[PDB]
Design a protein around this ligand. Sequence first.
Ligand code: SF4
Ligand code: SF4
Lengths: 531, 533
Amino acid sequence: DFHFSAIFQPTDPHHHQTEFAKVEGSEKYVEEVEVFGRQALKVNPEALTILAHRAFSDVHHFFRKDHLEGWRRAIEDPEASDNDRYVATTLLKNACIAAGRVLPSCQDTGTAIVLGKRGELCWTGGEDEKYLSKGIWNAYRYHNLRYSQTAALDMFKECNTGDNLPAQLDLLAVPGSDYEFLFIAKGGGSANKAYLYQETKALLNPKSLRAFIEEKLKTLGTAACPPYHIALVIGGTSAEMTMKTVKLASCRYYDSLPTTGDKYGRAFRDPEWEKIVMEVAQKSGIGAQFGGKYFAHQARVIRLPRHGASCPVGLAVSCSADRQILAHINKSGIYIEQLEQNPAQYLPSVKVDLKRPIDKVRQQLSQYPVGTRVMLNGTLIVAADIAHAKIKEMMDNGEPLPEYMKTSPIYYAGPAKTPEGYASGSFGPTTAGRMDSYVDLFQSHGGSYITLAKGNRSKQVTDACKKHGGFYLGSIGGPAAILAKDSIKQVTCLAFPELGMEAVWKIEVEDFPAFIVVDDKGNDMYSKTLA
Amino acid sequence: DFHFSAIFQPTDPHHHQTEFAKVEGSEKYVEEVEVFGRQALKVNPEALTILAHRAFSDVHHFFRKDHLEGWRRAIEDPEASDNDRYVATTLLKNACIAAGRVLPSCQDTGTAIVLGKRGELCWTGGEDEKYLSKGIWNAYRYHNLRYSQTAALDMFKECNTGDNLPAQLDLLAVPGSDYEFLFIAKGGGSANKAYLYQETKALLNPKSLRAFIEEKLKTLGTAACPPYHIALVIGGTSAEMTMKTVKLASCRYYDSLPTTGDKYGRAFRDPEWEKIVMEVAQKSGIGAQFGGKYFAHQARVIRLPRHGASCPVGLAVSCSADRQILAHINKSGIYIEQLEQNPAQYLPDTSVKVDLKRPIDKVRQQLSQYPVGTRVMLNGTLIVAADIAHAKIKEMMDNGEPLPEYMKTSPIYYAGPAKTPEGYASGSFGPTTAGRMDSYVDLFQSHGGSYITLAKGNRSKQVTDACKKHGGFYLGSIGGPAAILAKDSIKQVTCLAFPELGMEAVWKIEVEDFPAFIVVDDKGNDMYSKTLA
Ligand code: SF4
Ligand code: SF4
């Protein structure tokens, strides 16, 4: 009467649908042997270093076909908005810059995440995590990436680790003698849009589930640089299993799952509800960041078994920096997923002078409604999460709001490392909403009247800008390479250099595109679509 | 310049502080060999079946010392409320019943969760998941536990799997040649109280974190049968990593982590903020389910590294059915954590009788004479219906059918029983979380039924409004003591409707001396309105 059924039964468990290239001469790192009558694989652990170094280098310069196809779809669809096409064209041109292998596609070169599956008879020496970490260390150290990891010295005292370590190393024990990997360079912004809901059987009917999806998709907003790969997981054996499944779904790792359930509780992809998610995404009007049809590239919906008392639900996205790479080591050597190296084949406003008193810039901006396209020329002051917290702390101790918060628009950003002979590394905006609790405070103290970032913000910012005569300008989210190549002409560290990329910067920019999202009158260009 | 630092650096990674017993003669399942100059261990996979079977049998009848000590503390602490002491005494007596090895400590014998760490040179044949699932299958099939897993035939069509499979099998690749395990029999109610928050740097200061903790602890309520083991995880490399860490922290798996951070971003336990969580829990007044000091046994707070743009936060509890067991397989055989087999040594050495065998309207009149917080003793018939029964009945009404008569004659006990031992009137049969049925009460009451419900946990405001509009009541059973309720209170169980469902059928049961509190009355009063405002 006992029948074993694995929850996950992909028809393509080794990802044969993916194209792989072999690292030249890597067969020298492996040797097939036969021990106690079973075939086994000896792996020089240096192969893990070589593979991780290659994976976390290439993933920042190339994309998968299904990602690039989505941007072209937004450009060619007659039903796409002008803003849909403008954003998708900008992201494809950004991918073209990044394919030059110098500038990463996004300033946020992400957290290094390894899902590894070591066969029972795959022998590495056992030091997999150190050797993988060294390859990750090599990738971020010797390329123009960014150190994004924040170490906690105590509960509140933090410092940057200076090398983008630690990685998330999930190494699983599996049958066989191979070593299979999924590498993810996961941006912080899309990682923040991984949501867990604790639901009940009352959700599990067509009307309630549809209303749920419409409600939750809006809470993603534009804060993770859509078009999104949207993943939705209904059920699961625990919260962490639900959240792991929705992460992997967003990486299209479970695309070959079955599409029907059975009495043993196996996972399945549900294509009908993927279609409903896409229809909700399109009919929402949120669009590719600034209103339109292309809120989403595509959807993945996986139904899981559940404890009778439980219904965990996971919602997660892959952002414009859609960065994952499959790989495996076998008796022939190291194989790594081949990404698209010619993204160019997928390609089918008000000038605002900042070199004036800030009050004159505010007056010019006041003349236009939300949704106006602007082009910034001049100085921006760069300050993100930690700078804002330090500045607020200064003011709480009676110190004045610093002068550099009062002279120029505030660009929420953290740059990647500058290539030799370049004016700037990749330097796109960070999510504006995380700074929302500072706006009214800083504006009441005479600064931060104009902010520049990406993502929809909360109502408190709209009230602050109306009360104080402020503005929030929405940059396009994602195109960090073309912004650095075309717009950013000078970068200087201004304050808090110990913060690394989270220091305060002063940059000179030209032809920096943005939208007026919040004006000084109580208007918000997202108030209709993200009510 | 490269320095590798593992995120988790426990000082006791093999759990030497835990007491283990050897499965007799289990050295016959392993043999040491040497290949390519390295020591390896061949393991008969039958050892995984044996180990899983023993783990998921023993864990339902015994508890760890640190859990039992918490209940005794609630009884002996002068600062504990009378209800704190009453609840803790009831849970200890339940544990004494459960230690008889017939009745499981809770009717929800949980999801079977296996965390396994297979050494690189530990060779099982590779079929670990099948052999582990067979041992779990054995434990739930041949013991008086419960089949709690719900399979989805499509998005909305569901059925019970009938054997408590599938398990959650998380088998990790690690150095060495041994096999180390943490087995968890995770109840549904405490699994539902695992929360993920996406926060920011603006949270990371003493005032914001303190206010955050005070706010979130209240959202746990009493819905997962406190006293809780409270785990809080600040940071993490991803949501799923944060939620895995908070789960393991709640099992005290990370008790030996360091207590300070460093520039490499290692995880650490924070004893100062553990004390703050305990102070917030105690000062909340929520208590051991019915007001008091013992909202929490103990706290675990782990600070993790984070991406500069990210601050995921996890909050999770272990409930009164605190069920985990450590184990390992090595060259000497199979070793399994030793749990406390004499819980009675932790036991140290005024209510209104309600006759339910009357017209339901007369029962409502008697209850109307008492304030919330009154302790009652129920004698008579209860109609048992939980999540699926409620959804099926609502579906019937949506298609024009009347609310069934059996929803109007007796109070509704939200519960799902474990299997009945031979010669027993009932298996373990404690209450389910009341909040999950909140959306049905006003509908059912306006159709003349469900005027009196009996379950555990605080409920939402719509239930208080419904009981006021319709002259209804919500009675809070003690949450957890499923074994002593079955042995002492439940005298007869018969299936009334939906036999095709599993333990989620509608049941008709006769009870005696079934204790409960009036939580919501017919006047707008709620016993939790102050502590869970
Ligand atoms: S800035 Fe946008 S594209 Fe870059 S990692 Fe963050 S969410 Fe992704
Ligand atoms: S009923 Fe209470 S003690 Fe039992 S599993 Fe659910 S939350 Fe835990």
